[PDB]
Design an enzyme around this catalytic site. Structure first.
Site, PDB file in Angstrom:
ATOM      1  N   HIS A  86       0.842  -1.222   0.000  1.00 10.62           N
ATOM      2  CA  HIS A  86       0.000   0.000   0.000  1.00 10.62           C
ATOM      3  C   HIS A  86       0.873   1.267   0.000  1.00 10.62           C
ATOM      4  CE1 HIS A  86      -3.135   2.871   0.800  1.00 10.62           C
ATOM      5  NE2 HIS A  86      -2.596   3.153   2.020  1.00 10.62           N
ATOM      6  N   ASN A  87       0.554   2.172  -0.936  1.00  9.38           N
ATOM      7  CA  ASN A  87       1.164   3.518  -1.139  1.00  9.38           C
ATOM      8  C   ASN A  87       2.671   3.393  -1.020  1.00  9.38           C
ATOM      9  OD1 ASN A  87      -1.210   6.063   0.099  1.00  9.38           O
ATOM     10  ND2 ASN A  87      -1.455   4.416  -1.397  1.00  9.38           N
ATOM     11  N   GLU A 116       1.887   0.231  -5.692  1.00 10.79           N
ATOM     12  CA  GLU A 116       0.817   1.231  -5.929  1.00 10.79           C
ATOM     13  C   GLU A 116       1.426   2.556  -6.429  1.00 10.79           C
ATOM     14  OE1 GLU A 116      -2.170   1.613  -2.685  1.00 10.79           O
ATOM     15  OE2 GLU A 116      -3.478   2.774  -4.107  1.00 10.79           O
ATOM     16  N   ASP A 118       0.178   6.443  -7.218  1.00 16.55           N
ATOM     17  CA  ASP A 118      -0.906   7.456  -7.081  1.00 16.55           C
ATOM     18  C   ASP A 118      -0.544   8.638  -7.973  1.00 16.55           C
ATOM     19  OD1 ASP A 118      -1.939   5.925  -4.867  1.00 16.55           O
ATOM     20  OD2 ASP A 118      -2.382   7.791  -3.704  1.00 16.55           O
ATOM     21  N   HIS A 131       0.807  11.734  -2.307  1.00 13.78           N
ATOM     22  CA  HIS A 131      -0.513  11.522  -1.655  1.00 13.78           C
ATOM     23  C   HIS A 131      -1.351  12.794  -1.819  1.00 13.78           C
ATOM     24  CE1 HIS A 131      -3.131   9.844   1.823  1.00 13.78           C
ATOM     25  NE2 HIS A 131      -3.663   9.627   0.614  1.00 13.78           N
ATOM     26  N   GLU A 165      -3.586   4.424  -9.088  1.00  9.59           N
ATOM     27  CA  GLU A 165      -4.652   5.255  -8.505  1.00  9.59           C
ATOM     28  C   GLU A 165      -4.631   6.520  -9.343  1.00  9.59           C
ATOM     29  OE1 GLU A 165      -5.509   7.425  -4.635  1.00  9.59           O
ATOM     30  OE2 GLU A 165      -5.523   5.345  -3.816  1.00  9.59           O
TER      31      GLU A 165
END
Ligand SMILES: [Ca+2]
Length: 609
Positions: A86-87, A116, A118, A131, A165
């Site tokens: 995650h992230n 991931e 984003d 983020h 994302e």
């Protein structure tokens, strides 16, 4: 003066569950008995027997010696747990702290297979990663994709899944697509690759078939029915003027096996659909639709990620999700906590390659418990669990730089709720250097395939955890063994360890047979020692499987031309217990009925009728 070969074999079979030949045991004596005249008479001295088991190379984990199995990697992608980040771009806190490109390199080198991006708009028409709407630092999209290309296949050549994302414009979503193609080249899956994908009921292809491949996970444009619909929709857009909803076609065309969809509940075939649920929605799903979630994960991939509430980059327990067969449990790799250590223990299996085949109750139709199993339910009255004994004998240097701390050992059994339980020793007063506990815990387990043993060292004064180790239950070797401890970063502590005994028993039907398949049974190698076999040595070893039966072992021994049966013998510390073995009886089931340190050693004997 010492221990014979016949007697050292009974100890190794019964306590250590190691079936050695006459010669391999004569070797252990040669290696641990310095005194040559003892050695020449086949006797290990009492101080040498102690040296043999106290040896630093008497490790607990079988996973030291595990490697990729090609066959175990030949089933659909959805039958596997898949190590997930995650992230990945985040170093610490979710809303403050730095983004780092290198973090993709470190995570992927470790054996992680899902990461991931984003993706957001950069002020110069190039996509950036950070983020959204926070004080995270921004890193260039291009730099990250290069980092993934270099490091993706260094440690493991098993396919990665890039979780995009997507928060970019269409202009910068096209940039993204150019950069994916130019950097990954022929490793990027840009089309359906397999004969099996154009079949009546398609499944995802095997992680084997996809070696050295990169799968994008983004939204995919829905197919329009007619030319007129396209033009009409276009006229609608014009008419009103005076994640992102739109998707550049350039990028959509690169989405093949992993088409992101807002979760539909319980026209492209459905096995290519994948959904991403925050941990709360995934837990709701696991309580409410236990068996449906398992039938769903058999054919499709599902991905859980930490709740938005966890701004400190804490992690949720992965067990809830893995027991319902969720494949991508995405953790914050930058946060050392019990869940990240649970993650690491899971993906030691199968060579640390990052793809682990699921317990067959969550996909194999020929498993007695297929569709009958819900992991949150207590009423398993159909079956008799396996009995585990675990003795914490002693430790060494269990709290580094604190000679005078008072330690105890927390042992946690982590599995389905029914299998879960906590133990804790007495605290040893002011000795962290060679504390001795000699404390024993009993626990029963139904679902062996996904229990984790957590050993933690707790300094009773400060109640702080000074050392930690997690090991899959099925990975623990029977008998007296050394358990390498690790610091709170899951780094090896070169001197700190625990000395432990474990035992396993099997007395309605046994759980491990109810959760099994005839295919896994017959593929699980097990060794048996048999006394009285016509030949030089007084006991021979045989390779068999958990499915092999008395009648089959008899043929294996005897087939070489020169009215025999096998006898189950127990010799005591009396006159030996003797039970003739039934032609149709499972052999490995007999070896698992035995319990050591109960005044007998078990043998299997050949006898004339
Ligand atoms: Ca995110």
């Amino acid at each position: 003066f010492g221990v014979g070969i016949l007697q050292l074999n009974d100890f190794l079979v019964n306590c250590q569950g190691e079936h050695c030949t006459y010669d391999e045991i004569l070797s252990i004596i040669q290696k641990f008995e310095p005194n040559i005249s003892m050695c020449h008479q086949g006797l290990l001295s009492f101080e040498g027997f102690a040296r043999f088991l106290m040896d630093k190379d008497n490790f607990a984990s079988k996973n030291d010696e595990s490697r990729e199995n090609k066959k175990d990697l030949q089933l659909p992608l959805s039958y596997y747990y898949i190590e997930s980040s995650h992230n990945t771009y985040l170093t610490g806190h979710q809303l403050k702290g730095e983004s780092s490109v290198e973090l993709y390199s470190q995570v992927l080198l470790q054996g992680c297979r899902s990461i991931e991006l984003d993706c957001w708009d950069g002020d110069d028409g190039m996509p950036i990663i950070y983020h959204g709407h926070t004080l995270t630092t921004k890193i260039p999209f291009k730099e990250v994709v290069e980092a993934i290309d270099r490091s993706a296949f260094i440690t493991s050549d098993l396919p990665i899944i890039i979780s995009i994302e997507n928060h970019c414009s269409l202009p910068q979503q096209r940039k993204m697509a150019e950069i994916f193609k130019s950097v990954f080249g022929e490793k990027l899956v840009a089309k359906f690759l397999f004969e099996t994908d154009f079949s009546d009921d398609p499944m995802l292809p095997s992680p084997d078939q996809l070696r050295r491949k990169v799968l994008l996970k983004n939204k995919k444009l829905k197919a329009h029915q007619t030319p007129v619909d396209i033009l009409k929709q276009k006229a609608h857009q014009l008419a009103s003027m005076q994640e992102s909803r739109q998707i550049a076609p350039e990028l959509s065309d690169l989405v093949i096996y992993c088409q992101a969809v807002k979760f539909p509940g319980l026209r492209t075939p459905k096995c290519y659909h994948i959904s991403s649920l925050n941990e709360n929605a995934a837990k709701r799903l696991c309580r409410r639709y236990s068996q449906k979630l398992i039938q769903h994960t058999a054919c499709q991939l599902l991905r859980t990620y930490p709740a938005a509430t966890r701004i400190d980059s804490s992690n949720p327990n992965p067990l809830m999700f893995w027991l319902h067969g969720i494949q991508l449990v995405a953790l914050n790799y930058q946060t050392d906590d019990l869940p990240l250590h649970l993650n690491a223990a899971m993906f030691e299996a199968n060579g640390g390659c990052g793809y682990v085949l699921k317990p067959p109750v969550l996909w194999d139709k020929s498993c007695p418990m297929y569709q009958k199993f819900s992991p949150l339910e207590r009423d398993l009255d159909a079956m008799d669990p396996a009995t585990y004994s675990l003795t914490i004998i002693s430790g060494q240097n269990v709290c580094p730089s604190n000679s005078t701390g008072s330690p105890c050992i927390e042992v946690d059994v982590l599995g389905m709720p029914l299998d879960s339980c906590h133990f804790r020793t007495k605290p040893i007063h002011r000795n962290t250097l060679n504390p001795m506990w000699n404390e024993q815990f009993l626990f029963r387990v139904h679902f062996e395939d996904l229990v984790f043993l957590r050993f933690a060292v707790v300094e009773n004064n400060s109640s702080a955890i000074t050392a930690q180790r997690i090991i899959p239950l099925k990975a623990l070797k029977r008998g007296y063994r050394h358990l390498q401890l690790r610091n709170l970063h899951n780094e090896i502590l070169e001197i700190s360890s625990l000395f432990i005994n474990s035992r396993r028993m099997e007395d309605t039907r046994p759980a491990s047979l109810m959760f099994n398949t005839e295919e896994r049974k017959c593929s699980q190698t097990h060794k048996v020692t048999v006394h009285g076999v016509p030949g030089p040595e007084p006991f021979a070893v045989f390779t068999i499987n958990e499915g092999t039966k008395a009648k089959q072992l008899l043929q294996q021994i005897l087939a070489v031309d020169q009215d025999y049966f096998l006898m189950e013998e127990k010799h005591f510390i009396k006159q030996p217990f003797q039970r003739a073995v039934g032609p149709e009886e499972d052999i490995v089931q007999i070896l698992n009925s035995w319990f050591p340190e109960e005044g007998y050693v078990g043998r299997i004997v050949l006898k004339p009728q």
